[PDB]
Enzyme design. Sequence first.
Site, mmCIF file in Angstrom:
data_model
loop_
_atom_site.group_PDB
_atom_site.id
_atom_site.type_symbol
_atom_site.label_atom_id
_atom_site.label_comp_id
_atom_site.label_asym_id
_atom_site.label_seq_id
_atom_site.Cartn_x
_atom_site.Cartn_y
_atom_site.Cartn_z
ATOM 1 N N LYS A 7 41.924 -59.006 52.565
ATOM 2 C CA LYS A 7 40.806 -59.939 52.480
ATOM 3 C C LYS A 7 41.218 -61.411 52.398
ATOM 4 C CE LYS A 7 40.388 -59.596 47.416
ATOM 5 N NZ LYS A 7 39.737 -58.971 46.245
ATOM 6 N N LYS A 54 47.489 -53.618 36.284
ATOM 7 C CA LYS A 54 47.648 -54.997 35.804
ATOM 8 C C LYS A 54 46.342 -55.594 35.304
ATOM 9 C CE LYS A 54 48.155 -58.466 38.966
ATOM 10 N NZ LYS A 54 46.800 -59.017 38.745
ATOM 11 N N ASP A 70 43.731 -58.538 35.530
ATOM 12 C CA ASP A 70 43.358 -59.494 36.551
ATOM 13 C C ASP A 70 43.927 -60.861 36.145
ATOM 14 O OD1 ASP A 70 42.054 -60.132 39.019
ATOM 15 O OD2 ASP A 70 40.475 -58.769 38.583
ATOM 16 N N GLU A 71 44.206 -61.698 37.136
ATOM 17 C CA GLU A 71 44.789 -63.006 36.859
ATOM 18 C C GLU A 71 44.033 -63.770 35.784
ATOM 19 O OE1 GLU A 71 43.515 -62.433 40.147
ATOM 20 O OE2 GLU A 71 41.640 -63.233 39.431
ATOM 21 N N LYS A 91 39.339 -53.383 37.519
ATOM 22 C CA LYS A 91 38.075 -54.053 37.885
ATOM 23 C C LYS A 91 36.962 -53.419 37.048
ATOM 24 C CE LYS A 91 40.224 -56.251 41.156
ATOM 25 N NZ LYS A 91 40.420 -57.757 41.175
ATOM 26 N N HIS A 136 51.684 -64.045 39.401
ATOM 27 C CA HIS A 136 50.462 -64.206 40.176
ATOM 28 C C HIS A 136 50.355 -65.651 40.664
ATOM 29 C CE1 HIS A 136 46.180 -64.364 41.191
ATOM 30 N NE2 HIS A 136 46.243 -63.043 41.262
HETATM 31 O O1 LIG Z 1 41.786 -60.695 41.962
HETATM 32 C C1 LIG Z 1 42.028 -59.988 43.140
HETATM 33 O O2 LIG Z 1 41.247 -60.157 44.188
HETATM 34 C C2 LIG Z 1 43.206 -59.022 43.145
HETATM 35 O O3 LIG Z 1 43.227 -58.363 41.851
HETATM 36 C C3 LIG Z 1 42.988 -57.972 44.222
HETATM 37 O O4 LIG Z 1 41.949 -57.106 43.841
HETATM 38 P P1 LIG Z 1 41.697 -55.907 44.872
HETATM 39 O O5 LIG Z 1 42.944 -55.029 44.867
HETATM 40 O O6 LIG Z 1 40.503 -55.145 44.426
HETATM 41 O O7 LIG Z 1 41.463 -56.509 46.266
HETATM 42 C C4 LIG Z 1 44.504 -59.783 43.374
HETATM 43 O O8 LIG Z 1 44.735 -60.593 42.236
HETATM 44 C C5 LIG Z 1 44.456 -60.635 44.639
HETATM 45 O O9 LIG Z 1 45.056 -59.902 45.678
HETATM 46 C C6 LIG Z 1 45.193 -61.963 44.519
HETATM 47 O O10 LIG Z 1 45.283 -62.549 45.807
HETATM 48 P P2 LIG Z 1 46.697 -62.848 46.485
HETATM 49 O O11 LIG Z 1 47.609 -61.595 46.394
HETATM 50 O O12 LIG Z 1 46.471 -63.268 47.902
HETATM 51 O O13 LIG Z 1 47.307 -64.064 45.765
HETATM 52 MG MG LIG Z 2 43.245 -60.413 40.621
#
Ligand SMILES: O=C(O)[C@@](O)(COP(=O)(O)O)[C@H](O)[C@H](O)COP(=O)(O)O
Ligand SMILES: [Mg+2]
Lengths: 351, 118, 469, 469, 122
Positions: free
Chosen positions: C328, C195, C197-198, C169, C288
């Site tokens: 969350k 990783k 981020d998506e 982040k 993801h």
């Molecule tokens: O982009 C985000 O919010 C995360 O990097 C979490 O960041 P944090 O670790 O800071 O919360 C993950 O990609 C989400 O958990 C995806 O959601 P899910 O797993 O429900 O598909």
């Molecule tokens: Mg993410």
Amino acid sequence: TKAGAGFKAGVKDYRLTYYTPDYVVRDTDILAAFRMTPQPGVPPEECGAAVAAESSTGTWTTVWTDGLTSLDRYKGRCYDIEPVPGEDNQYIAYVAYPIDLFEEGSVTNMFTSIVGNVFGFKALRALRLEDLRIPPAYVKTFVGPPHGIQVERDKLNKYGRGLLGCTIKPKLGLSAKNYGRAVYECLRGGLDFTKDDENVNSQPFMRWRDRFLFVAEAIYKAQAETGEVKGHYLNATAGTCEEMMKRAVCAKELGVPIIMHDYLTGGFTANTSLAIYCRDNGLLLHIHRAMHAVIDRQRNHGIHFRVLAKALRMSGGDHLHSGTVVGKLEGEREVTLGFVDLMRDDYVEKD
Amino acid sequence: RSRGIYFTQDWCSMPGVMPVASGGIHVWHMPALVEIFGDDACLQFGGGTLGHPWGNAPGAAANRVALEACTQARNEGRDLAREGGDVIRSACKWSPELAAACEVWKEIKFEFDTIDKL
Amino acid sequence: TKAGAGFKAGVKDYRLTYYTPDYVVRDTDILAAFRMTPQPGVPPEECGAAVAAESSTGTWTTVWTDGLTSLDRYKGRCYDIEPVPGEDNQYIAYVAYPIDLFEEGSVTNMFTSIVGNVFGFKALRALRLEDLRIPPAYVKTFVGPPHGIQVERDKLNKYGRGLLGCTIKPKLGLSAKNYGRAVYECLRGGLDFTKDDENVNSQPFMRWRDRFLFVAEAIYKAQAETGEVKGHYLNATAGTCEEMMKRAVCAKELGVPIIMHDYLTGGFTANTSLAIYCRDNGLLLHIHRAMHAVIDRQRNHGIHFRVLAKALRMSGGDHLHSGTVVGKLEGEREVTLGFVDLMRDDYVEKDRSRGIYFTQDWCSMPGVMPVASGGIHVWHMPALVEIFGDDACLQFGGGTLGHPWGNAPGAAANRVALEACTQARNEGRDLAREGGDVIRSACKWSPELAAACEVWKEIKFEFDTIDKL
Amino acid sequence: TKAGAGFKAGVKDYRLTYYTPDYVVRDTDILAAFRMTPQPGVPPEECGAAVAAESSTGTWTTVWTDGLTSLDRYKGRCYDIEPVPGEDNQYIAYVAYPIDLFEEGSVTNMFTSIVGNVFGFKALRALRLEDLRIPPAYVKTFVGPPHGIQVERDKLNKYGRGLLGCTIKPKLGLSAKNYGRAVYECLRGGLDFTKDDENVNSQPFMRWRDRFLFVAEAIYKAQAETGEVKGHYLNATAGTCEEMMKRAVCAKELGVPIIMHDYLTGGFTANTSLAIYCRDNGLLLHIHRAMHAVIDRQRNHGIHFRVLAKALRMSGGDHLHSGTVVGKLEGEREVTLGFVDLMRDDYVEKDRSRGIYFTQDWCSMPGVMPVASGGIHVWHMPALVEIFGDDACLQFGGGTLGHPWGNAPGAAANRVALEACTQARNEGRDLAREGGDVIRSACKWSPELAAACEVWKEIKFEFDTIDKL
Amino acid sequence: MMVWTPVNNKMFETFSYLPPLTDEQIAAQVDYIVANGWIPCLEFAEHSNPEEFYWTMWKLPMFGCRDPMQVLREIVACTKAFPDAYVRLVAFDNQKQVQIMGFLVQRPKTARDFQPANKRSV
Ligand SMILES: O=C(O)[C@@](O)(COP(=O)(O)O)[C@H](O)[C@H](O)COP(=O)(O)O
Ligand SMILES: [Mg+2]
Ligand SMILES: O=C(O)[C@@](O)(COP(=O)(O)O)[C@H](O)[C@H](O)COP(=O)(O)O
Ligand SMILES: O=C(O)[C@@](O)(COP(=O)(O)O)[C@H](O)[C@H](O)COP(=O)(O)O
Ligand SMILES: [Mg+2]
Ligand SMILES: [Mg+2]
């Protein structure tokens, strides 16, 4: 049922279509500033309009095909003309080009329209392209430089001072082994870089692959001795795209961090290819501006270096020679400071 | 030197390049073009074709007739530098396509002071 | 001499051909469970028949070409309709599709029949695909996950605990050099993975190849410093298949053990290609599920995540995000436990109390590692270990990069919390009941953990659940 | 010499960074309009800020790495929130995204940020992406449609009327030989196109290459017989990118003018690759929107079709299904007229009465031909011509293969109906009012049309609309 | 059941499936061109093959023409000069830069490769 504007064969003034002083420029237009010297008897408005016409949609006589399309949508527009202070027959003519006129990602195409034919018109005595406004919507169509300043510093792990380089001499006539000898001794003393001279390509006195191999050995020995990251710009400039690429591929295989290309003598089409290759393979790309002064030296005619520099930025390069101001080649201080900002910065205000 | 040739140039059988005369030319220029270049040239008429009052095919025909009439006249011993206008005038009277081109561009010339002088 | 069944032009009810309540399903049929809400005046039998018809062989009026083939052999069949408890206008319609309807090894094709057109029919108000029974004979036509859980653990040489990951982040805005910096500091503190981020693909602020190279340096440095195998899921997600493959090829060249793909925004066709490439080259593939909640959030309409998860398993992935239950993003406990079993296990019996509408036999297709990620922190650790067990990866992005002392301390806090919970469980302690005590003891012992404990002590995510059984 | 803004660990409200109601949007920003339903107790400003944050740069707790970059430069911004008329708990939240956040030319990446994670946040009950403002500077990074409407008409040499198509039926179960048989009989009666059903890929009853060959024969025979250019959209939809490309390559080798792709079940990454291949090879590309209603049906949650249409225009397609308004699948008139303009036109002004939330400037990216298909017949023709105008393809599957005299008479009936409506319109007749008269006159004149008129006379599709403005 | 004939049943794009256009019907089409501000143009050819994109232009497109009588007179002039040719009336939209309408106004008389309306099915 009375007829609208139809096809009328024959010559009329360019200004009737191409001088539009009330035009409001669009944020996606490419803008040009031409320093224009009309022949005696040619009104500046007609001269400006001829430049706009023959760099966009128009030719010397009326063509019926205009009717099949919309000239309003496509035409270049001379939208402002200012006299030049201290000159009785020089004007800055401002021309706006719709974004649809240009091939995406092609500096070659942009130059072909804007500087292709107009500089040889009998009706003018001299023409110089001073500047271009490249709009974000066109900029976004280009890959651009392989890395750029910040990425380059991160790839070299070098911070907090200017980088230091050095062209090997004599320009031509050294063997590959002596080239590497000179390189090693240069780099080991504290230079970050050395380079092939712009005209060192492949020649009877020194074939390129022999040089590349010796130079790689010199880079490695100097880096191990000094404990600092070293490089040498190996020249990929060649007679054909295929030879150019062969040279880049060999540099990549050797693991050398940087190559160079002469963008104007090699040309924009080759340069863009090379930049893309350098992006795809993590090679730093040093750009030599050989031949620029043929184009950019004279005040009254040609293309100012700032435009050639913008064009290089778009085509792609990690370094570009800027002049020294104080050295053996010309470059006035304020002119240089201006295009250095145009080369490095994200946003440069009119000045 | 009177033609700007500073060195004797030997091309050692490298093939010759066809000159292309193009840009603001029309039917009345045809005799001068044939006289300057001879047969080994391409002569291009963009505006001089697509600007013909009857459209492209008549425009092309006018240009082709003009070229052929000039070529024939030259082969017959006529001096195109001197009698070129006469050749075009004769051809205009014969070909309605050419006549229409002759009329539209009759007054049109490009004569300015030369920058690139020897 | 008299005629049998001939061609009669015109519209008739779908139910005349497509509602077959006495049909005995075959062991090779694909079965679907649709939660269906008919428009007023449309009988549930006709609604179910329309869904079966228009996802298999039928259209709105009778066609003569049926006679050239055998509709009996090919037609989809609504074979059962049950009313939904607590609903006056919702029904579960069960549809059976012959195996011949489907292209072998193509998730894209299966979705195109089953969910292609029917959700837009005027004659229904809402439609939700709840579950699919993928028969072994169809499962066997798929390459499936590149490795699967057991092979993955063997390739990482990691056993006896949950894996730990972490999204870097801020999501976007970091340079390549800073990305690798963050990654090194995260991994060296005890995380197994970081990783992209998506949405980190290739952008003006950070180009992908620059990132790949710096991240590879970071992985190598943290592995050498800690003496433990490290990885970072480099994102292959791209605008075209060619760009996607270029990225995967570079990751392979660099020798990095794992990449990631956004299977829904990239798509099943690209995802299957990538999974095959990963199998062929021994790359681990993290999946993801970006965009899934656009489809799977609402109870009345869309596709339940369990179906999206089955589809991923078939198309191919070594990991897939599973939700956290306690973080969350939404995911109800029982619903989650159900699809976790569907992702990991070889054979899962029908169990409506966990949203499993059909017994699912995976015929030895490898299991997919569930990844719990999103808004979780050290106090969630006991609940996470309790829900998922060891076969999961637990990811702490904010819960690492949000640690007051930085990434390496943040990683160490998470690793200590995970190991403390794991040890406690192995010792017979009930994490559901004593989880708070395990964390409190661990906080007192480890200063890195203590600092995390204090900062996120009050932080919980407790909201009314939309996606309820 | 006080300290400026430093790193403070822990959770704070998203609104402190991501709600910026005084922000002046830039001409290069991507704008999103989200229909947002917050959980009780979650202020709309915090909800909008959460959506902006977690689709751009933010996570659930504060991260130290923000300080290495410039959040002001990169953060998504909720810049306006309006209550929705007639709703107590729905708001339109407007979010601005800097152009730097997005990978050039990648619909996949755009969707990954904007719709990736936010729809699953516990803090909201429902979320729907209604519209996107794609700025010219971003539009310019896309290849776009392989040809677009004008180029397509030029390549087909077809002018002055809507195009006519037809899905072969039954959907599945026909052999390749019978497929080509049906195609020939259809095209020879006056249809411009036929097509594979969206789910016709390659299957045990009919392998793709067998089909392609027979369909090519059928196209050629019908073209020679009628003297009019014919096509048939051969389906390149496949399980992997490699299979999809193989199919496109074969269609090119056969010289067939047009193929199709299911962009959502295949996916954006595959679709963009295919579109580029079609541009590079002069292939017309028909896009089927299979699965869209899974996403776009419900008013409260998902993505509106207009956004899915804009995304297709960017990814690339020559045709895209638009709905019929009057047929078997849902599509309200004003909603449809709105996105039809967004698909075809160069510049579309904001118009909330048509669901257009932003003025859209396509900066000369080619327009996409709308295809009206699904449960339509000859009596619908005047309404279809009135709604769509000439720049559309109208498809009659059942409406052709359901004709009592077979495919060629069926095609003839549809072609006569279209031509009579077209002529009548050109003559100044009001099709909305006098459409029935135009068809009735045409029925009396053409025995093929008469037979169609009689069979389908009573058939209408009128239901309460779910996807209402 | 009537059978659509494959024999000598060639079609010629827009309006070929309708009864042959009357003079009044052609005039109404020309009115439609004028009302919409499109550019009328005539094109002609000895033969009509689906594979052949271009025909020969009659003169030039009638730029600025807002007079239906002028268009109808050019139809007469074109068909007079080429009485055995296929002749079509088309119109261009210069904004979208595309042909926006088009239909046949003459076919060769020696042509027997198409059917009268009531002979299209048997
Ligand atoms: O982009 C985000 O919010 C995360 O990097 C979490 O960041 P944090 O670790 O800071 O919360 C993950 O990609 C989400 O958990 C995806 O959601 P899910 O797993 O429900 O598909
Ligand atoms: Mg993410
Ligand atoms: O763009 C033009 O103006 C032309 O197309 C001529 O058009 P017209 O035939 O309508 O004049 C040619 O490219 C010029 O001749 C190039 O100049 P040069 O031959 O001197 O290099
Ligand atoms: O599978 C079908 O139902 C169709 O082949 C139509 O067949 P008929 O012509 O026989 O009705 C089309 O694919 C749908 O219209 C798609 O729906 P939409 O256009 O709304 O995406
Ligand atoms: Mg030098
Ligand atoms: Mg279909």
